[PDB]
Design a protein around this nucleic acid. Sequence first.
DNA 1: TTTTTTTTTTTTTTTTTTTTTTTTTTTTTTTTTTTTTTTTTTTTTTTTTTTTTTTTTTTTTTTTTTTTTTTTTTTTTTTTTTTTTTTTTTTTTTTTTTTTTTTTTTTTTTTTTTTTTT
Length: 89
Amino acid sequence: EYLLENPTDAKIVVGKIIDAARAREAARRAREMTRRKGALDLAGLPGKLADCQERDPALSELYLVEGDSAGGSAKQGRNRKNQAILPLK
DNA sequence: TTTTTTTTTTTTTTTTTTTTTTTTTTTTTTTTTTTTTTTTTTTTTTTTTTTTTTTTTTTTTTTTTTTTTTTTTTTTTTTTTTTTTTTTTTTTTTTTTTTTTTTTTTTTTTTTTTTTTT
């Protein structure tokens, strides 16, 4: 409600947050985009992998879990944008 | 208000690589054919007393050609070296034991929908 009420202060705070995010992004290591597992294309990755939507590394995670039951428990609750799961045996 | 620069994913189809279906050659495997072993009995072979006329060894002496013999010069034998094979320490790898962590499959039964063939 406060953000909707105060446009100028909200814009100033958003500018500060964007500057902080840019400062965080500048220091990261150089990299390149990577294909991710998807419905239309699998990219030759395992069936057990439950990959994420984010194509950029440094904004994605891989959770190495112990089995298929733990894999399902972690896959049900996660963030599909960043987090991926690869259940071992 | 019109007009100008740049950015990427698509019209893409062709080159490279990968994956997936194939069928010549040395190593297994089932068959027939030839080496082994145990019984019957069977004429047949073979073990053992008696007699007998034989034909080769032992009295005695003879010689000659194999046994004496010495010596030259070869040539098999032995020495060193190195290579090839055999054989045994050494190491590596794999399997089994019993409590732990993880998973993965094949079929019945009915009813309805896709998904190919005719």
